[PDB]
Structure 1
Amino acid sequence: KYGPLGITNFITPYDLCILILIHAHCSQDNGISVPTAVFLRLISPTRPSLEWNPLLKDNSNLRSSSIVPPPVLPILDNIIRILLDDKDGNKIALTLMGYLEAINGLDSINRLMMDLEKNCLVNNYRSMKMRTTSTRRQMTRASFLGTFLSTCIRKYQIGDFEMRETIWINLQNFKTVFKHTPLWLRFKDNVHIQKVKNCLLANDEISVEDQQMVEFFQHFNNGNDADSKTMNEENYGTLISIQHLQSIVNRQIVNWLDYEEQSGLVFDLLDTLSLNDATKFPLIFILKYLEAIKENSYQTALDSLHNYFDYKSTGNSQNYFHISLLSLATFHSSFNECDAAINSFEEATRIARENKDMETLNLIMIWIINFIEVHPEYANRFYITVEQIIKYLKNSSDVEDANIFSNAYKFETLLSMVKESKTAEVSSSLLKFMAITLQNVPSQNFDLFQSLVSYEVKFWKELGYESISDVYEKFLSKTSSSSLRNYDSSIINQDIKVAFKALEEDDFLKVKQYLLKSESLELDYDQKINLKYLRVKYLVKIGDYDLSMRLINQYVKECCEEVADSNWRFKFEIESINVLLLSDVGIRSLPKIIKLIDEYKEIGNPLRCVILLLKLCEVLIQVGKSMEAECLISCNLSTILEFPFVRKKTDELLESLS
């Protein structure tokens, strides 16, 4: 079924197949009505125009609410397999098969097309009711099939005889490809084919003289191979319109990003473009780019991106130069270049000002924090602080925003969490973002919906209620990851959870091997901290604390200046507390534990309050004053069983007291 591919603005052989089907359905002589699902799989990809920005926008409208079958490749083998499935589909399948056999000439093609325009297609409904004398079903222009057939009619009267010959030379090539196929052998003889073929072949007006030599014209052109064939220019094996190519490509990249498709056929066919249709179809370049990132090829990613943004900008009259840099900026942030991405972004701001268009500034601002969300360590380097944006976007407008406010509040929630604000405000801020996101369609805005889950899971986990987190985590998508953050980040993130479990099950060999990968990998900041946090926990289990103690303090000291992450500061502080008290000297930590207790009492996070209580209890029992420790733990035992993961520590301490 493979062959050279070329974009054609004329009637592709695939197109006639629908025209074959619609003829049988409207004729109503055979009583064969093609099922509606068949048409909606065939015509709909040919419906024009979808558009798909390279990055900076993911499936904002491409996702169909109902799952649709993949678009069909223009090969008789694939087309027939759709009709073939039904028990009576053989009858429908043979109807198509017979018509393709009856159509043996360019004139016969014209007979089909003249028939539809004169009788089947009709300008408007008001003439339906007057045409009750028609033995065939009549079509309205505005209908689903009507608008399609109008386009097909237009594409036939649009060209000279030069295009009509290409239709027939290609169709016979297209028809004969199916002939040397195993399925055609299964349908070598079906008697019904002759019946349907003779239905339309009738009224030939000659059977004795012209038919003797009519065959001679057909056969001589055809490759009878008795002699050397008539030499003709190389002809393409498959012809598709631009719009049909758009559907197959968009489905392929979406399927790749996260009823069976034919990846090999699509990829092979897309590799035979004459390099001119590639100009007419710039999206072929980016299809390599998405493939390029998968194997982590740097230069091969770059040239493709530059390739895509040169043909797109010229084709579209609106200035998209202000969009090219951001995609390139995303690409650099994808390879952790970071600093180079920074320079890329600044000149995007200047370009936006010259265009003097307001709507693009919202797009450039929204990209800022999305970048800083991945790399919070770069907040100081931007010319605008994060808080300025939130204040700006909160009062941006009251209309023509839709998703901006949903984006606006989530950034405040993240900042509010990191700034360790009081839980009352954080709950309210997340409330705003939750209400606005769910109010509109959440399925269509798949990116933000996932981000909501991540924040909520994180938020409730910090409060210590895994029961709530357990419900939400089932909605978190794995391996989906997000844009502008690498491509193997999901693999790394999954691996880290493995290491933590391995640490719990005392699999020191596996975790040890993973830390070796740590020092030479390019990792995101959030990933970096986890491994940085992973190492200190591992060193505690081994027993060496001189190295860890010098290591933990460096981490927390740099966890307060470079990034003002209070949550990660807390987790590191308590590890140091564990290190001290484990070495029989936790008394040094008494100043440190107390200053956090009253500090978090004001905050009101119960999980924080309880964990320090256990540490306070543990230090008091290694002193020899376990008497009062028992008294304190007795009064607070009720409120400390609410948190699951501390129960194991809480239970274990109980037998110690006995």
Structure 2
Amino acid sequence: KYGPLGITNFITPYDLCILILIHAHCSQDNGISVPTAVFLRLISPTRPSLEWNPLLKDNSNLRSSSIVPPPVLPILDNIIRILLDDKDGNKIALTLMGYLEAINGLDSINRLMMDLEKNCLVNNYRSMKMRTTSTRRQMTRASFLGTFLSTCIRKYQIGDFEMRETIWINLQNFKTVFKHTPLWLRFKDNVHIQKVKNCLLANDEISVEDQQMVEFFQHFNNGNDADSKTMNEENYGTLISIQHLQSIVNRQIVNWLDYEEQSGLVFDLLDTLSLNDATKFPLIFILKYLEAIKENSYQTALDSLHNYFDYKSTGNSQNYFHISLLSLATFHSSFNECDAAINSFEEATRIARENKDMETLNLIMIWIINFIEVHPEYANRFYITVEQIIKYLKNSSDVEDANIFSNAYKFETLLSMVKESKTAEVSSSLLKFMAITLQNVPSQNFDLFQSLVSYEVKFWKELGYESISDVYEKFLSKTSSSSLRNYDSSIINQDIKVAFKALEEDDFLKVKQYLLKSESLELDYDQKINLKYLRVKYLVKIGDYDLSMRLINQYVKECCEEVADSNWRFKFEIESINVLLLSDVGIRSLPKIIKLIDEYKEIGNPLRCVILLLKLCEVLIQVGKSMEAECLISCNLSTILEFPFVRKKTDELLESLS
């Protein structure tokens, strides 16, 4: 089914296949009505235009609410397998089989075009009811098939005789390809083919004289191979329109990003383009660009990325230079270059001002904090602080925003969570973001919906309620990840959770080998801290504490200056408490623990107070004053069982007191 691929502005052999089916359905002489599902799979890919930006937008509208079958490749083998599935589909498939055998010439092709335009197609419904004398079904221009057939008819009167000669040469080439297939052998004889074929071949006006040499003109042109064939220019094996090719690739990249498809067939045909279709169809370059990221190729990806932005910018009359730089900046952020992306992005702001268009700045401003969210350590380098943006976007407008406010409030929530603000304000801010996301469609905006789940699981896990976290955890999508943050980030993140499980299960050999991978991999900041935190916990288990104690405080010191992450400042703090008291010297931690107790009492996070409570009771039991620790734990025993992951530490202390 493979062959050279070429873009054609004329009647592809695929287009006539739909034309064959619509003729049978409208003729109503055979009583054969094509199922509505068959038409919706064939014509719909041909419908014009879907559009797809490289990045900055993921499946904003491309996602179909109802799952759709993949578009069908232009091979007679693939089209039949659609009709063939039905028990009576052999009747429908044979109808197409007979017609494709009936059309042995270009004049016959013209017969089909003339029949549809004069009788079948109808200008408007007002003449439909006055055409009750028609023995065939009639179609309106504005209908689904009507607008399709009008374009096909327009696409037929547009070319010269050179256009029609190429029509018939390829179809016979297209037809004879299916002849050398196993499926054709199963349909070698079907008696119904002769019946349907003879229905249209009648009224030939000659059967004695012209048909002897009518055969001669075709056979001589065809490759009988008795002698050397008549020499002709190389002809493409498959012809596809721009719109049909757009639907296959868009489905392929979406399917690759996250009824069976043919990845092998689509990729081979797309590799045989004549280098002029790629200019008329720039999206072929990016199809390599997504593939290039998969194997993590640096030089290959950049040439494809640059190539896609040279062809797209000129075709679109609007200025798109202000979009190319940030996307390249996005690509730079994907390979953890970070600093190189900053210089590239900076020049994007200057070009946007020259255009003097307001709508693009919001796209620029949204990209700002998305990059800072992945890499919070660069918040100082920007010319605008993160708090400035939130104040601008909150009062941005009252109309024509839709998703801007949904974006605006989530960034405030991350900063408030990092700033260890009061839990009353964090819940209210998160409420603002949850209400605006779910108000509109959450399915189309898959990216923010996943980010809601990630925050809410993180927010409630921080509160200490795993029961709530578990419900939302089943909705967080895996391996989906997000744009501008690598491509193997999902694999690494899944690996971190395995390592944490291995520490609990005392698989010290596994974690030790993984820590070797940590020091020479390029990791996102959120991934850095976890492995940075993982290294601290592993060293505590081993028993060596001089290195870990000198190591943990440098982390927290740079966890307060480089990034003002309070949550990770707290989480790092308690291991040092655990390191001290495990070494039979926890009194040094008494000044440190109390500063956090009254500090977190004002905040009101119950998980924070109780964890400090366990460390306080544990301090008091290693000094020789376990009497009052029992009294203190007894009054608060009711409120400390509400948190599941501390019960194991809580229950274990109970047998010690006994």
**TM-score, normalised by the number of residues in structure 1:** 1.00
- Please name the residue that 1:163 is paired with: 163
Query: Distance between the aligned counterparts of 2:464 and 2:629, measured in 1?
Result: 23
Q: C-alpha separation between the residues in 1 aligned to 2:654 and 2:133?
A: 94
Query: 1:532 Cα shift?
Result: 0.1
Superimposed CA distance per residue, residues 2-29 of structure 1 (whole angstroms, 9 cap, x where no aligned partner)? 0000000000000000000000000000
How far the C-alpha of 1:221 sits from its partner, in A, is 0.1
**How far has the Cα of 1:516 moved from its partner?**
0.2
Matches of 1:641 and 1:97, distance apart in 2: 73
**Partner deviation per Cα, 1:64-119 (whole Å, 9 max, x = no partner):** 00000000000000000000000000000000000000000000000000000000
Partner deviation per Cα, 1:296-320 (whole Å, 9 max, x = no partner)? 0000000000000000000000000
- Deviation (angstroms), 1:417: 0.2
Q: Deviations over 1:604-633 (max 9, x none)?
A: 000000000000000000000000000000
SS in 1 for 2:239: strand
**CA positional deviation for 1:492:** 0.1
Q: Which runs of 4+ in 1 moved over 4 A?
A: none
Equivalents in 2 of 1:625, 1:106: separation in Å?
103
The alignment status of 1:174 with 2:182, answered yes or no, reads: no
Q: Which residue in 1 is equivalent to 2:611?
A: 611
Shift of 1:560: 0.2
1:519-568 Cα shifts (integer Å, max 9, x gaps): 00000000000000000000000000000000000000000000000000
User: By how many angstroms is 1:51 displaced?
Assistant: 0.3
SS class of match (2:383): coil
C-alpha displacement at 1:265, in angstroms? 0.2
Instruction: Please state how far the C-alpha of 1:373 moved relative to its aligned partner.
Output: 0.3
| CA deviation profile, 1:481-519 (whole Å, cap 9, x unmatched) | 000000000000000000000000000000000000000
**Alignment partners' CA distance in 2, 1:40 and 1:553:** 64
1:154-205 Cα deviation digits (max 9, x unpaired): 0000000000000000000000000000000000000000000000000000
**Secondary structure of the residue that 1:498 maps to in structure 2?**
helix
Aligned to 1:70: 70
Secondary structure in 2 matching 1:152: helix
Alpha-carbon distance, 1:291 to partner: 0.1
SS, match of residue 136 in structure 2:
coil
Task: Tell me the CA shift for residue 239 of structure 1.
Answer: 0.3
Q: Secondary structure at the match of 2:67?
A: coil
The whole-number CA distance in structure 1 between the counterparts of 2:41 and 2:228 is 42
Residue 437 of structure 1, CA deviation: 0.2
Q: Deviation of residue 33 (structure 1)?
A: 0.1
How far is 1:295 from its partner? 0.2
* Structure 1 partner of 2:546: 546
Matched ranges for 1:3-42 at <5 A: 3-42=3-42
CA distance in 1: counterparts of 2:351 and 2:13, whole angstroms: 46
C-alpha distance in structure 1 between counterparts of 2:326 and 2:168, whole Å: 47
Quote the offset at 1:343 in angstroms.
Answer: 0.2
Q: Distance in 1 between matches of 2:538 and 2:342?
A: 35
Paired with 2:251 and 2:183, the residues of 1 have a C-alpha distance of: 27
- Structure 2 CA distance for aligned equivalents of residues 586 and 489 of structure 1: 39
Deviation at 1:369, TM superposition (A): 0.1
1:349-395 residue CA offsets vs partner (Å, 9 max, x unmatched): 00000000000000000000000000000000000000000000000
| TM-aligned CA deviation for residue 34 of structure 1 | 0.2
How far apart, CA to CA, are the structure 2 residues paired with 1:597 and 1:398?
Answer: 43
* SS of equivalent to 1:118: helix
User: What are the ranges of 5 or more consecutive residues in structure 2 without an aligned counterpart?
Assistant: none
User: 1:460-483, CA deviations, whole angstroms, 9 ceiling, x for partnerless residues?
Assistant: 000000000000000000000000
SS at match of 1:92: helix
Give % identity. 100
> Shift of the alpha carbon at 1:228?
0.1
Cα offset, 1:145, TM superposition: 0.1
Cα shift at 1:445:
0.2
What TM-score does the superposition give when structure 2 sets the normalisation length? 1.00
CA distance in 2, matches of 1:11, 1:593: 79
Give 1:590 deviation, angstroms.
0.2
Mapped partners of 1:405, 1:182: distance in 2: 58
Tell me how far apart the structure 2 counterparts of residues 56 and 252 of structure 1 sit (CA, whole Å). Answer: 19
Q: What is the SS of the residue equivalent to 2:498?
A: helix
Q: Distance in 1 between matches of 2:398 and 2:629?
A: 57
Using the alignment, how far apart are the partners of 2:514 and 2:257 within structure 1?
28
Q: RMSD in angstroms over aligned alpha carbons?
A: 0.2
- For 1:430 and 1:326, the matched residues in 2 are separated by 29
Q: CA deviation at 1:134?
A: 0.1
SS of corresponding position for 1:54: coil
**Alpha-carbon distance in 2 for matches of 1:386, 1:552:** 29
Structure 2: distance between partners of 1:155 and 1:561: 67
Matched with 1:218 is: 218
Distance 2:639 2:560 in 1: 31
SS at match of 1:239: strand
SS at match of 2:170: helix
* Aligned-pair CA distance for 1:396: 0.1
Structure 2 CA distance, aligned partners of 1:572 and 1:606?
A: 18
Give how far 1:419 is off. Answer: 0.1
Tell me the SS of whatever aligns to 2:379: helix
Aligned to 1:654: 654
User: Secondary structure at 2:196's aligned position in 1?
Assistant: helix
- In 2, Cα distance between equivalents of 1:364 and 1:509: 46
Q: Distance in 2 between matches of 1:552 and 1:609?
A: 22
Which residue pairs with 1:263 in the alignment? Answer: 263
**Structure 2: distance between partners of 1:382 and 1:371:** 11
Distance of 2:502 and 2:57 partners within structure 1: 38
Q: Distance in 2 between matches of 1:247 and 1:456?
A: 36
Deviation, structure 1 residue 120:
0.2
Deviations 1:103-142 (A, max 9, x none): 0000000000000000000100000000000000000000
Distance 2:308 2:300 in 1: 12
How many residues are paired up? 658
Indicate the residue corresponding to 1:593 in structure 2: 593
- CA distance in 1 between counterparts of 2:11 and 2:232 reads 21
| Residues 197-242 of structure 1 deviation map (CA, whole Å, 9 limit, x = unaligned) | 0000000000000000000000000000000000000000000000
The CA distance in 2 between the partners of 1:642 and 1:402, in whole Å, is 40
Does the residue aligned with 2:70 lie in a helix, a strand or coil? coil
In the alignment, structure 1 residue 413 sits paired with structure 2 residue 413 = yes
How far apart, in 1, do the equivalents of 2:178 and 2:418 lie? 63
Partner Cα distance (1:619, 1:632) in 2: 13
Separation (CA, whole Å) in 2 of partners of 1:373 and 1:273: 41
Q: Distance in 2 between matches of 1:121 and 1:326?
A: 49
The secondary structure found in structure 1 opposite 2:544 is coil
Per the alignment, residue 362 of structure 1 pairs with: 362
CA distance in 1 between counterparts of 2:287 and 2:656 reads 63
Tell me what 1:233 maps to: 233
Q: Supply the distance in 2 between the matched residues of 1:576 and 1:207 (Cα, whole angstroms).
A: 100
Counterparts of 1:625 and 1:516, CA distance in 2: 43
Structure 1 distance, partners of 2:284, 2:506, is 50
SS in 2 for 1:6: strand
Partner SS, residue 380 of structure 1: coil
Structure 1 gaps, min length 5: none
CA distance in 2, matches of 1:586, 1:31: 90
Deviation for aligned residue 1:423:
0.2
Which string of whole-angstrom CA distances, capped at 9 and with x for unpartnered residues, describes residues 37-88 of structure 1?
Answer: 0000000000000000000000000000000000000000000000000000
Q: Tell me, what secondary structure is at the counterpart of 2:247?
A: helix
